[PDB]
């Protein structure tokens, strides 16, 4: 319950922060969240990022800095960034929404 509250707050401030708007689907979508990454998946994702970015060493070098520390959700966050490179439209929105807030 007080879990779901936090999810709703998160959905809500994004709607606010991204200038949106039925977002009850996002609640259902985010509420199927059952636990498992693979060793290739993070490799597959990781090579795809390094292709995309300029300065790929910086990404890889601080991937390395930050895996030795076991920092939390490192690999699911890197999987997300690979997924974001693919969809060039929503990559650009996030790109722009950040220009708006400076």
């Amino acid at each position: 319950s007080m879990s779901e509250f936090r999810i709703h707050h998160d959905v809500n401030e994004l709607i606010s922060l991204l200038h949106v708007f039925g977002a009850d689907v996002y609640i259902d979508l985010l509420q199927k969240n059952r636990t498992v990454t693979t060793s290739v998946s993070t490799h597959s994702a990781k090579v795809k990022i390094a292709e995309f970015s300029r300065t790929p060493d910086d990404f890889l070098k601080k991937y390395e800095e930050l895996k030795s520390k076991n920092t939390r959700n490192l690999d699911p966050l890197v999987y997300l960034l690979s997924k974001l490179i693919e969809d060039k439209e929503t990559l650009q929105y996030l790109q722009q929404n950040a220009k708006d807030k400076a």
């Binding site: 998160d10 996002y26 939390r72 966050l77 929105y93 996030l94 929404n97």
Partner: protein, 50 residues
Amino acid sequence: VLNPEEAELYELTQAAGIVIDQEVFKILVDLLKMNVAPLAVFQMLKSMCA
């Protein structure tokens, strides 16, 4: 805005080539922290945009 732990991950995504403003980055990280699948985060992010 966001703390040493999140500051690292932001720098990571940053040198990874993407830029998203610290405020939404913080929430994403948080959605991950509450064990939401990255794909689910991505899917809703995709829907929330154009």
